[PDB]
Amino acid sequence: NRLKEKYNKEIAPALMTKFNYDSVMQVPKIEKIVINMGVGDAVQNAKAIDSAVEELTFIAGQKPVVTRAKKSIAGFRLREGMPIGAKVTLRGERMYDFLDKLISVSLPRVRDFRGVSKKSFDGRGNYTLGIKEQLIFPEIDYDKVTKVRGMDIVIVTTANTDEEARELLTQVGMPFQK
Amino acid sequence: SLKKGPFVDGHLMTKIEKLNETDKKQVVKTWSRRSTIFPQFIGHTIAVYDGRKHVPVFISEDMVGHKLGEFAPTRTYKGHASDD
Amino acid sequence: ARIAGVDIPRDKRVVISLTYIFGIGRTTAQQVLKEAGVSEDTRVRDLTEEELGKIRDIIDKLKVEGDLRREVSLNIKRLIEIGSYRGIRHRRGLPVRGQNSKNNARTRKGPRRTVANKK
RNA sequence: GGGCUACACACGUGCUACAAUGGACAGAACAAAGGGCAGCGAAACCGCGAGGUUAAGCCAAUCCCACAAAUCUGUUCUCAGUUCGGAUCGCAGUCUGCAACUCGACUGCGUGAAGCUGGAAUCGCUAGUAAUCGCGGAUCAGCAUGCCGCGGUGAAUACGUUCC
RNA sequence: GGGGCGGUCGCCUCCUAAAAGGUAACGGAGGCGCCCAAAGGUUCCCUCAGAAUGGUUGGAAAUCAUUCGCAGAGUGUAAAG
């Protein structure tokens, strides 16, 4: 909750002076994060896609749900049924308890990483990010999982423009390659 | 190399020195590829004598300790018959 | 997992156990243990609750796994954009150090196959 | 200045391994022969190492190259792509040379291919031979897994001329 | 539109059929001797296809976020409604 108090006292007042706001009260707000698994099956016979689903319980406490395909693909499995990947939509106090782990711990842990996200902005608001290691998340043990599985994060901004959406992220302490 | 130090033939030294102090002449041939690139030599473009034909070479800040003639390969690729 | 070099194994003596770390080798392990005074110790993994931490700091001074991979990667990327000739050897499948090609040197070339005959 | 060192590949011929009769560490111990003054270069000192600084002696049964290695004695790993093997490459040094990019050697550090004994087929050798471990020299500014030698350790089998 | 040969014989959709319906030809285009205990019944909820942008192993596409989408979707199977 320390991150949650942080924008209630530090970020917002500074954000208010950076440019004018209609009706004073208006301020961009984080909405939902969506974590993707993908897995890739390779090919369909994981055999246990659910074993990957258990792994995501560590990255976030919200229960993952498998994303069943709504369309068949000629190049890869499969027609509808036998779900591929998983999805999570953490909210509330969980939102900043998770984001606090992201800046302070997750991103710096990565080897080659120093900073990203420049062209990444939609020009509308939403942020996107890729995650390629479970070593990135401290709660996971090294002994578990063995083979690497992919991950994603998508922060949402209330702001109607990326210029406002970006400035909100900078005060959060989010890294940028610059 | 070893110590004291990298060794240009020394004619390239006075050439690039005069070209640096004034004139700013560009594109010059050299037969002596053995000479190493120097910080004073930066930004010049030299036609490198591989033997068959001179190959011009711009000098980025990144290249210094690499030999000047190293950048141009005398070798012709490949040559092979049925590719793919 | 793990406290220093990520994913060090188990049921092995500590020296070979952190030689596995992408960074420290054998003699470097001999040096960090010479600083340690462990004496080997311990065949399995049971060191000490705080000594594991002080060793974790000395290993932390050394650097560093996937970022060390980024060192070699950024280095060869420096070796290709520079012109070049060395990175040219890195991607021809040509050996870089300079040891012919008329025979062997299959470390990059791979096994199969063949596409010639006469007559 | 290049090239004789090409590179998708084939073949001939060597080297190193695929490991517990072993690997790694520590201690201990036994050679022969050859080379050396535009040379060998001890010892002392500096550097983890390579080498460097400095310099005694030696035209050599005097001195130097020079320490023999396998082995033995213990410690340790306990059967695996491994403390097996070292490839490839990166970085940082070093010897020689006006000069080490093409296209030299060596070292320190890091990276840790393939290979867990190999199809068809094929080679050597009747005893100090095969097996294997180190050393020296010719070559030579530098460069010897090749060649020529030196010694250490040191077997199995030979019924026989049916067959090649 | 002589017979023989070929093809066809029943049911269902559209057009030809001419703004009720019907309506012929060996006229023009297609389907069916099924399928489903659920894709049925009821109740409570939800809205598509495709596009653009951003993104790990994701490439023209498996997955996910967003503006756009009066339906360019889906409606077991084929057409009209």
PDB file of all heavy atoms in Angstrom, chain E residues 52-64:
ATOM      1  P     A E  52      -4.631  -3.701 -40.617  1.00  0.00           P
ATOM      2  OP1   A E  52      -3.713  -3.710 -41.760  1.00  0.00           O
ATOM      3  OP2   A E  52      -4.680  -4.855 -39.717  1.00  0.00           O
ATOM      4  O5'   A E  52      -4.321  -2.406 -39.744  1.00  0.00           O
ATOM      5  C5'   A E  52      -4.560  -1.108 -40.262  1.00  0.00           C
ATOM      6  C4'   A E  52      -4.645  -0.084 -39.161  1.00  0.00           C
ATOM      7  O4'   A E  52      -5.887  -0.248 -38.430  1.00  0.00           O
ATOM      8  C3'   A E  52      -3.577  -0.176 -38.087  1.00  0.00           C
ATOM      9  O3'   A E  52      -2.345   0.402 -38.482  1.00  0.00           O
ATOM     10  C2'   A E  52      -4.234   0.523 -36.905  1.00  0.00           C
ATOM     11  O2'   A E  52      -4.168   1.934 -37.056  1.00  0.00           O
ATOM     12  C1'   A E  52      -5.691   0.086 -37.070  1.00  0.00           C
ATOM     13  N9    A E  52      -6.011  -1.093 -36.246  1.00  0.00           N
ATOM     14  C8    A E  52      -6.017  -2.380 -36.669  1.00  0.00           C
ATOM     15  N7    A E  52      -6.365  -3.172 -35.613  1.00  0.00           N
ATOM     16  C5    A E  52      -6.575  -2.359 -34.523  1.00  0.00           C
ATOM     17  C6    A E  52      -6.945  -2.636 -33.195  1.00  0.00           C
ATOM     18  N6    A E  52      -7.351  -3.870 -32.861  1.00  0.00           N
ATOM     19  N1    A E  52      -7.086  -1.627 -32.307  1.00  0.00           N
ATOM     20  C2    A E  52      -6.864  -0.325 -32.704  1.00  0.00           C
ATOM     21  N3    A E  52      -6.503  -0.051 -34.002  1.00  0.00           N
ATOM     22  C4    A E  52      -6.359  -1.085 -34.910  1.00  0.00           C
ATOM     23  P     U E  53      -0.957  -0.291 -38.061  1.00  0.00           P
ATOM     24  OP1   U E  53       0.136   0.353 -38.834  1.00  0.00           O
ATOM     25  OP2   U E  53      -1.137  -1.764 -38.130  1.00  0.00           O
ATOM     26  O5'   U E  53      -0.783   0.114 -36.530  1.00  0.00           O
ATOM     27  C5'   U E  53      -0.751   1.477 -36.141  1.00  0.00           C
ATOM     28  C4'   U E  53      -0.796   1.627 -34.640  1.00  0.00           C
ATOM     29  O4'   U E  53      -2.112   1.271 -34.146  1.00  0.00           O
ATOM     30  C3'   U E  53       0.144   0.729 -33.855  1.00  0.00           C
ATOM     31  O3'   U E  53       1.477   1.206 -33.830  1.00  0.00           O
ATOM     32  C2'   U E  53      -0.519   0.676 -32.485  1.00  0.00           C
ATOM     33  O2'   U E  53      -0.249   1.863 -31.753  1.00  0.00           O
ATOM     34  C1'   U E  53      -2.000   0.674 -32.868  1.00  0.00           C
ATOM     35  N1    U E  53      -2.556  -0.698 -32.932  1.00  0.00           N
ATOM     36  C2    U E  53      -2.936  -1.289 -31.742  1.00  0.00           C
ATOM     37  O2    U E  53      -2.835  -0.733 -30.662  1.00  0.00           O
ATOM     38  N3    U E  53      -3.444  -2.560 -31.858  1.00  0.00           N
ATOM     39  C4    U E  53      -3.603  -3.283 -33.021  1.00  0.00           C
ATOM     40  O4    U E  53      -4.074  -4.421 -32.971  1.00  0.00           O
ATOM     41  C5    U E  53      -3.185  -2.604 -34.211  1.00  0.00           C
ATOM     42  C6    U E  53      -2.689  -1.365 -34.126  1.00  0.00           C
ATOM     43  P     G E  54       2.703   0.167 -33.853  1.00  0.00           P
ATOM     44  OP1   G E  54       3.942   0.925 -34.166  1.00  0.00           O
ATOM     45  OP2   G E  54       2.313  -0.989 -34.698  1.00  0.00           O
ATOM     46  O5'   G E  54       2.802  -0.335 -32.346  1.00  0.00           O
ATOM     47  C5'   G E  54       2.924   0.596 -31.281  1.00  0.00           C
ATOM     48  C4'   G E  54       2.567  -0.024 -29.954  1.00  0.00           C
ATOM     49  O4'   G E  54       1.198  -0.497 -29.972  1.00  0.00           O
ATOM     50  C3'   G E  54       3.369  -1.244 -29.539  1.00  0.00           C
ATOM     51  O3'   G E  54       4.638  -0.905 -29.011  1.00  0.00           O
ATOM     52  C2'   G E  54       2.449  -1.914 -28.525  1.00  0.00           C
ATOM     53  O2'   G E  54       2.542  -1.269 -27.266  1.00  0.00           O
ATOM     54  C1'   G E  54       1.069  -1.616 -29.120  1.00  0.00           C
ATOM     55  N9    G E  54       0.524  -2.757 -29.882  1.00  0.00           N
ATOM     56  C8    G E  54       0.532  -2.958 -31.241  1.00  0.00           C
ATOM     57  N7    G E  54      -0.043  -4.080 -31.591  1.00  0.00           N
ATOM     58  C5    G E  54      -0.453  -4.652 -30.394  1.00  0.00           C
ATOM     59  C6    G E  54      -1.130  -5.873 -30.129  1.00  0.00           C
ATOM     60  O6    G E  54      -1.525  -6.733 -30.926  1.00  0.00           O
ATOM     61  N1    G E  54      -1.344  -6.056 -28.766  1.00  0.00           N
ATOM     62  C2    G E  54      -0.956  -5.177 -27.781  1.00  0.00           C
ATOM     63  N2    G E  54      -1.251  -5.526 -26.522  1.00  0.00           N
ATOM     64  N3    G E  54      -0.325  -4.039 -28.014  1.00  0.00           N
ATOM     65  C4    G E  54      -0.108  -3.844 -29.330  1.00  0.00           C
ATOM     66  P     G E  55       5.979  -1.474 -29.686  1.00  0.00           P
ATOM     67  OP1   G E  55       7.028  -0.427 -29.587  1.00  0.00           O
ATOM     68  OP2   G E  55       5.625  -2.037 -31.014  1.00  0.00           O
ATOM     69  O5'   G E  55       6.400  -2.681 -28.737  1.00  0.00           O
ATOM     70  C5'   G E  55       6.093  -4.021 -29.086  1.00  0.00           C
ATOM     71  C4'   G E  55       5.425  -4.750 -27.947  1.00  0.00           C
ATOM     72  O4'   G E  55       3.987  -4.742 -28.137  1.00  0.00           O
ATOM     73  C3'   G E  55       5.774  -6.223 -27.813  1.00  0.00           C
ATOM     74  O3'   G E  55       7.001  -6.434 -27.136  1.00  0.00           O
ATOM     75  C2'   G E  55       4.565  -6.785 -27.079  1.00  0.00           C
ATOM     76  O2'   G E  55       4.636  -6.491 -25.691  1.00  0.00           O
ATOM     77  C1'   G E  55       3.434  -5.963 -27.690  1.00  0.00           C
ATOM     78  N9    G E  55       2.813  -6.640 -28.843  1.00  0.00           N
ATOM     79  C8    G E  55       3.077  -6.413 -30.172  1.00  0.00           C
ATOM     80  N7    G E  55       2.375  -7.167 -30.972  1.00  0.00           N
ATOM     81  C5    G E  55       1.599  -7.940 -30.121  1.00  0.00           C
ATOM     82  C6    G E  55       0.637  -8.942 -30.413  1.00  0.00           C
ATOM     83  O6    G E  55       0.270  -9.359 -31.517  1.00  0.00           O
ATOM     84  N1    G E  55       0.088  -9.475 -29.253  1.00  0.00           N
ATOM     85  C2    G E  55       0.416  -9.092 -27.974  1.00  0.00           C
ATOM     86  N2    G E  55      -0.229  -9.728 -26.984  1.00  0.00           N
ATOM     87  N3    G E  55       1.309  -8.159 -27.689  1.00  0.00           N
ATOM     88  C4    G E  55       1.857  -7.630 -28.802  1.00  0.00           C
ATOM     89  P     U E  56       8.277  -7.006 -27.929  1.00  0.00           P
ATOM     90  OP1   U E  56       9.473  -6.802 -27.074  1.00  0.00           O
ATOM     91  OP2   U E  56       8.257  -6.451 -29.305  1.00  0.00           O
ATOM     92  O5'   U E  56       8.001  -8.569 -28.020  1.00  0.00           O
ATOM     93  C5'   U E  56       7.523  -9.285 -26.892  1.00  0.00           C
ATOM     94  C4'   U E  56       8.399 -10.465 -26.568  1.00  0.00           C
ATOM     95  O4'   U E  56       8.094 -10.932 -25.224  1.00  0.00           O
ATOM     96  C3'   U E  56       8.204 -11.700 -27.433  1.00  0.00           C
ATOM     97  O3'   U E  56       8.775 -11.620 -28.739  1.00  0.00           O
ATOM     98  C2'   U E  56       8.697 -12.825 -26.523  1.00  0.00           C
ATOM     99  O2'   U E  56      10.116 -12.870 -26.445  1.00  0.00           O
ATOM    100  C1'   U E  56       8.185 -12.343 -25.167  1.00  0.00           C
ATOM    101  N1    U E  56       6.846 -12.894 -24.858  1.00  0.00           N
ATOM    102  C2    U E  56       6.809 -14.156 -24.302  1.00  0.00           C
ATOM    103  O2    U E  56       7.813 -14.803 -24.070  1.00  0.00           O
ATOM    104  N3    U E  56       5.548 -14.629 -24.031  1.00  0.00           N
ATOM    105  C4    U E  56       4.349 -13.985 -24.255  1.00  0.00           C
ATOM    106  O4    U E  56       3.293 -14.547 -23.956  1.00  0.00           O
ATOM    107  C5    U E  56       4.475 -12.686 -24.834  1.00  0.00           C
ATOM    108  C6    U E  56       5.688 -12.194 -25.106  1.00  0.00           C
ATOM    109  P     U E  57      10.355 -11.754 -29.028  1.00  0.00           P
ATOM    110  OP1   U E  57      11.120 -11.091 -27.943  1.00  0.00           O
ATOM    111  OP2   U E  57      10.586 -11.337 -30.436  1.00  0.00           O
ATOM    112  O5'   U E  57      10.633 -13.321 -28.940  1.00  0.00           O
ATOM    113  C5'   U E  57       9.825 -14.250 -29.647  1.00  0.00           C
ATOM    114  C4'   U E  57      10.116 -15.670 -29.221  1.00  0.00           C
ATOM    115  O4'   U E  57       9.817 -15.828 -27.807  1.00  0.00           O
ATOM    116  C3'   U E  57       9.281 -16.753 -29.882  1.00  0.00           C
ATOM    117  O3'   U E  57       9.688 -17.071 -31.205  1.00  0.00           O
ATOM    118  C2'   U E  57       9.391 -17.896 -28.887  1.00  0.00           C
ATOM    119  O2'   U E  57      10.666 -18.516 -28.972  1.00  0.00           O
ATOM    120  C1'   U E  57       9.316 -17.131 -27.566  1.00  0.00           C
ATOM    121  N1    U E  57       7.917 -17.020 -27.087  1.00  0.00           N
ATOM    122  C2    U E  57       7.421 -18.068 -26.333  1.00  0.00           C
ATOM    123  O2    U E  57       8.087 -19.047 -26.044  1.00  0.00           O
ATOM    124  N3    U E  57       6.119 -17.924 -25.918  1.00  0.00           N
ATOM    125  C4    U E  57       5.274 -16.866 -26.180  1.00  0.00           C
ATOM    126  O4    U E  57       4.126 -16.883 -25.739  1.00  0.00           O
ATOM    127  C5    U E  57       5.854 -15.827 -26.975  1.00  0.00           C
ATOM    128  C6    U E  57       7.121 -15.938 -27.387  1.00  0.00           C
ATOM    129  P     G E  58       8.613 -17.645 -32.260  1.00  0.00           P
ATOM    130  OP1   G E  58       7.510 -18.283 -31.500  1.00  0.00           O
ATOM    131  OP2   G E  58       9.355 -18.438 -33.271  1.00  0.00           O
ATOM    132  O5'   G E  58       8.016 -16.354 -32.990  1.00  0.00           O
ATOM    133  C5'   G E  58       7.438 -15.281 -32.251  1.00  0.00           C
ATOM    134  C4'   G E  58       6.211 -14.710 -32.920  1.00  0.00           C
ATOM    135  O4'   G E  58       5.061 -15.543 -32.607  1.00  0.00           O
ATOM    136  C3'   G E  58       5.846 -13.296 -32.469  1.00  0.00           C
ATOM    137  O3'   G E  58       5.257 -12.587 -33.561  1.00  0.00           O
ATOM    138  C2'   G E  58       4.788 -13.552 -31.400  1.00  0.00           C
ATOM    139  O2'   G E  58       3.910 -12.471 -31.172  1.00  0.00           O
ATOM    140  C1'   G E  58       4.061 -14.757 -31.985  1.00  0.00           C
ATOM    141  N9    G E  58       3.340 -15.570 -30.999  1.00  0.00           N
ATOM    142  C8    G E  58       2.036 -15.369 -30.614  1.00  0.00           C
ATOM    143  N7    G E  58       1.620 -16.217 -29.716  1.00  0.00           N
ATOM    144  C5    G E  58       2.722 -17.027 -29.481  1.00  0.00           C
ATOM    145  C6    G E  58       2.865 -18.129 -28.598  1.00  0.00           C
ATOM    146  O6    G E  58       2.028 -18.617 -27.830  1.00  0.00           O
ATOM    147  N1    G E  58       4.142 -18.673 -28.667  1.00  0.00           N
ATOM    148  C2    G E  58       5.149 -18.217 -29.480  1.00  0.00           C
ATOM    149  N2    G E  58       6.309 -18.880 -29.398  1.00  0.00           N
ATOM    150  N3    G E  58       5.027 -17.191 -30.307  1.00  0.00           N
ATOM    151  C4    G E  58       3.795 -16.641 -30.257  1.00  0.00           C
ATOM    152  P     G E  59       6.123 -11.518 -34.387  1.00  0.00           P
ATOM    153  OP1   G E  59       7.284 -12.228 -34.984  1.00  0.00           O
ATOM    154  OP2   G E  59       6.362 -10.347 -33.508  1.00  0.00           O
ATOM    155  O5'   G E  59       5.154 -11.060 -35.563  1.00  0.00           O
ATOM    156  C5'   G E  59       4.491 -12.012 -36.390  1.00  0.00           C
ATOM    157  C4'   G E  59       5.331 -12.389 -37.588  1.00  0.00           C
ATOM    158  O4'   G E  59       6.121 -13.564 -37.259  1.00  0.00           O
ATOM    159  C3'   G E  59       4.546 -12.743 -38.846  1.00  0.00           C
ATOM    160  O3'   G E  59       5.280 -12.328 -39.998  1.00  0.00           O
ATOM    161  C2'   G E  59       4.495 -14.267 -38.799  1.00  0.00           C
ATOM    162  O2'   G E  59       4.320 -14.890 -40.052  1.00  0.00           O
ATOM    163  C1'   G E  59       5.854 -14.597 -38.186  1.00  0.00           C
ATOM    164  N9    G E  59       5.899 -15.879 -37.473  1.00  0.00           N
ATOM    165  C8    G E  59       6.837 -16.866 -37.647  1.00  0.00           C
ATOM    166  N7    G E  59       6.642 -17.906 -36.884  1.00  0.00           N
ATOM    167  C5    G E  59       5.503 -17.589 -36.156  1.00  0.00           C
ATOM    168  C6    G E  59       4.813 -18.334 -35.166  1.00  0.00           C
ATOM    169  O6    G E  59       5.079 -19.459 -34.723  1.00  0.00           O
ATOM    170  N1    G E  59       3.707 -17.645 -34.683  1.00  0.00           N
ATOM    171  C2    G E  59       3.314 -16.398 -35.099  1.00  0.00           C
ATOM    172  N2    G E  59       2.215 -15.898 -34.513  1.00  0.00           N
ATOM    173  N3    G E  59       3.949 -15.692 -36.018  1.00  0.00           N
ATOM    174  C4    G E  59       5.028 -16.340 -36.507  1.00  0.00           C
ATOM    175  P     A E  60       4.900 -10.962 -40.752  1.00  0.00           P
ATOM    176  OP1   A E  60       5.989 -10.634 -41.675  1.00  0.00           O
ATOM    177  OP2   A E  60       4.489  -9.984 -39.740  1.00  0.00           O
ATOM    178  O5'   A E  60       3.618 -11.343 -41.615  1.00  0.00           O
ATOM    179  C5'   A E  60       2.783 -10.335 -42.170  1.00  0.00           C
ATOM    180  C4'   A E  60       1.349 -10.789 -42.255  1.00  0.00           C
ATOM    181  O4'   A E  60       1.237 -11.882 -43.203  1.00  0.00           O
ATOM    182  C3'   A E  60       0.751 -11.350 -40.975  1.00  0.00           C
ATOM    183  O3'   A E  60       0.319 -10.342 -40.078  1.00  0.00           O
ATOM    184  C2'   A E  60      -0.373 -12.232 -41.494  1.00  0.00           C
ATOM    185  O2'   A E  60      -1.501 -11.449 -41.858  1.00  0.00           O
ATOM    186  C1'   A E  60       0.252 -12.799 -42.767  1.00  0.00           C
ATOM    187  N9    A E  60       0.899 -14.103 -42.534  1.00  0.00           N
ATOM    188  C8    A E  60       2.234 -14.314 -42.439  1.00  0.00           C
ATOM    189  N7    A E  60       2.437 -15.645 -42.222  1.00  0.00           N
ATOM    190  C5    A E  60       1.207 -16.262 -42.182  1.00  0.00           C
ATOM    191  C6    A E  60       0.834 -17.601 -41.991  1.00  0.00           C
ATOM    192  N6    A E  60       1.768 -18.561 -41.995  1.00  0.00           N
ATOM    193  N1    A E  60      -0.473 -17.946 -41.999  1.00  0.00           N
ATOM    194  C2    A E  60      -1.440 -16.982 -42.195  1.00  0.00           C
ATOM    195  N3    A E  60      -1.076 -15.671 -42.382  1.00  0.00           N
ATOM    196  C4    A E  60       0.263 -15.316 -42.375  1.00  0.00           C
ATOM    197  P     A E  61       0.499 -10.542 -38.494  1.00  0.00           P
ATOM    198  OP1   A E  61      -0.712 -10.045 -37.832  1.00  0.00           O
ATOM    199  OP2   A E  61       1.804  -9.990 -38.116  1.00  0.00           O
ATOM    200  O5'   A E  61       0.564 -12.121 -38.313  1.00  0.00           O
ATOM    201  C5'   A E  61      -0.154 -12.769 -37.272  1.00  0.00           C
ATOM    202  C4'   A E  61      -1.533 -13.181 -37.724  1.00  0.00           C
ATOM    203  O4'   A E  61      -1.430 -14.063 -38.871  1.00  0.00           O
ATOM    204  C3'   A E  61      -2.351 -13.977 -36.726  1.00  0.00           C
ATOM    205  O3'   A E  61      -2.962 -13.163 -35.741  1.00  0.00           O
ATOM    206  C2'   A E  61      -3.347 -14.708 -37.619  1.00  0.00           C
ATOM    207  O2'   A E  61      -4.413 -13.846 -37.994  1.00  0.00           O
ATOM    208  C1'   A E  61      -2.494 -14.990 -38.859  1.00  0.00           C
ATOM    209  N9    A E  61      -1.939 -16.358 -38.854  1.00  0.00           N
ATOM    210  C8    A E  61      -2.666 -17.482 -39.060  1.00  0.00           C
ATOM    211  N7    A E  61      -1.825 -18.555 -38.983  1.00  0.00           N
ATOM    212  C5    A E  61      -0.560 -18.081 -38.726  1.00  0.00           C
ATOM    213  C6    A E  61       0.666 -18.741 -38.554  1.00  0.00           C
ATOM    214  N6    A E  61       0.762 -20.053 -38.823  1.00  0.00           N
ATOM    215  N1    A E  61       1.791 -18.031 -38.307  1.00  0.00           N
ATOM    216  C2    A E  61       1.730 -16.656 -38.224  1.00  0.00           C
ATOM    217  N3    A E  61       0.527 -16.010 -38.392  1.00  0.00           N
ATOM    218  C4    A E  61      -0.625 -16.735 -38.646  1.00  0.00           C
ATOM    219  P     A E  62      -2.733 -13.476 -34.182  1.00  0.00           P
ATOM    220  OP1   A E  62      -4.024 -13.353 -33.497  1.00  0.00           O
ATOM    221  OP2   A E  62      -1.591 -12.681 -33.722  1.00  0.00           O
ATOM    222  O5'   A E  62      -2.306 -15.010 -34.160  1.00  0.00           O
ATOM    223  C5'   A E  62      -2.226 -15.731 -32.935  1.00  0.00           C
ATOM    224  C4'   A E  62      -3.320 -16.765 -32.828  1.00  0.00           C
ATOM    225  O4'   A E  62      -2.780 -18.064 -33.200  1.00  0.00           O
ATOM    226  C3'   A E  62      -3.917 -16.937 -31.433  1.00  0.00           C
ATOM    227  O3'   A E  62      -5.302 -17.264 -31.549  1.00  0.00           O
ATOM    228  C2'   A E  62      -3.153 -18.139 -30.889  1.00  0.00           C
ATOM    229  O2'   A E  62      -3.826 -18.848 -29.868  1.00  0.00           O
ATOM    230  C1'   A E  62      -2.984 -18.984 -32.145  1.00  0.00           C
ATOM    231  N9    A E  62      -1.840 -19.895 -32.104  1.00  0.00           N
ATOM    232  C8    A E  62      -1.911 -21.243 -31.978  1.00  0.00           C
ATOM    233  N7    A E  62      -0.641 -21.734 -31.982  1.00  0.00           N
ATOM    234  C5    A E  62       0.226 -20.676 -32.112  1.00  0.00           C
ATOM    235  C6    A E  62       1.626 -20.605 -32.174  1.00  0.00           C
ATOM    236  N6    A E  62       2.359 -21.693 -31.897  1.00  0.00           N
ATOM    237  N1    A E  62       2.240 -19.407 -32.306  1.00  0.00           N
ATOM    238  C2    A E  62       1.491 -18.255 -32.384  1.00  0.00           C
ATOM    239  N3    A E  62       0.117 -18.318 -32.325  1.00  0.00           N
ATOM    240  C4    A E  62      -0.509 -19.544 -32.189  1.00  0.00           C
ATOM    241  P     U E  63      -6.421 -16.227 -31.045  1.00  0.00           P
ATOM    242  OP1   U E  63      -7.725 -16.940 -31.004  1.00  0.00           O
ATOM    243  OP2   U E  63      -6.288 -14.982 -31.844  1.00  0.00           O
ATOM    244  O5'   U E  63      -5.995 -15.899 -29.546  1.00  0.00           O
ATOM    245  C5'   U E  63      -6.096 -16.882 -28.528  1.00  0.00           C
ATOM    246  C4'   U E  63      -5.217 -16.550 -27.350  1.00  0.00           C
ATOM    247  O4'   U E  63      -3.830 -16.484 -27.773  1.00  0.00           O
ATOM    248  C3'   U E  63      -5.464 -15.200 -26.695  1.00  0.00           C
ATOM    249  O3'   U E  63      -6.569 -15.204 -25.810  1.00  0.00           O
ATOM    250  C2'   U E  63      -4.132 -14.917 -26.013  1.00  0.00           C
ATOM    251  O2'   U E  63      -4.022 -15.654 -24.805  1.00  0.00           O
ATOM    252  C1'   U E  63      -3.145 -15.496 -27.026  1.00  0.00           C
ATOM    253  N1    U E  63      -2.630 -14.466 -27.956  1.00  0.00           N
ATOM    254  C2    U E  63      -1.576 -13.685 -27.521  1.00  0.00           C
ATOM    255  O2    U E  63      -1.062 -13.818 -26.424  1.00  0.00           O
ATOM    256  N3    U E  63      -1.140 -12.745 -28.423  1.00  0.00           N
ATOM    257  C4    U E  63      -1.642 -12.508 -29.685  1.00  0.00           C
ATOM    258  O4    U E  63      -1.143 -11.623 -30.380  1.00  0.00           O
ATOM    259  C5    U E  63      -2.733 -13.355 -30.059  1.00  0.00           C
ATOM    260  C6    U E  63      -3.177 -14.279 -29.205  1.00  0.00           C
ATOM    261  P     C E  64      -7.650 -14.018 -25.868  1.00  0.00           P
ATOM    262  OP1   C E  64      -8.702 -14.306 -24.860  1.00  0.00           O
ATOM    263  OP2   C E  64      -8.031 -13.808 -27.288  1.00  0.00           O
ATOM    264  O5'   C E  64      -6.837 -12.737 -25.380  1.00  0.00           O
ATOM    265  C5'   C E  64      -6.262 -12.696 -24.084  1.00  0.00           C
ATOM    266  C4'   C E  64      -5.658 -11.347 -23.786  1.00  0.00           C
ATOM    267  O4'   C E  64      -4.442 -11.159 -24.550  1.00  0.00           O
ATOM    268  C3'   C E  64      -6.507 -10.138 -24.141  1.00  0.00           C
ATOM    269  O3'   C E  64      -7.508  -9.875 -23.172  1.00  0.00           O
ATOM    270  C2'   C E  64      -5.469  -9.026 -24.275  1.00  0.00           C
ATOM    271  O2'   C E  64      -5.128  -8.495 -23.006  1.00  0.00           O
ATOM    272  C1'   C E  64      -4.259  -9.787 -24.829  1.00  0.00           C
ATOM    273  N1    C E  64      -4.079  -9.595 -26.285  1.00  0.00           N
ATOM    274  C2    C E  64      -3.410  -8.444 -26.705  1.00  0.00           C
ATOM    275  O2    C E  64      -3.006  -7.644 -25.847  1.00  0.00           O
ATOM    276  N3    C E  64      -3.220  -8.227 -28.025  1.00  0.00           N
ATOM    277  C4    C E  64      -3.669  -9.109 -28.915  1.00  0.00           C
ATOM    278  N4    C E  64      -3.457  -8.850 -30.207  1.00  0.00           N
ATOM    279  C5    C E  64      -4.355 -10.297 -28.516  1.00  0.00           C
ATOM    280  C6    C E  64      -4.536 -10.499 -27.204  1.00  0.00           C
TER     281        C E  64
END
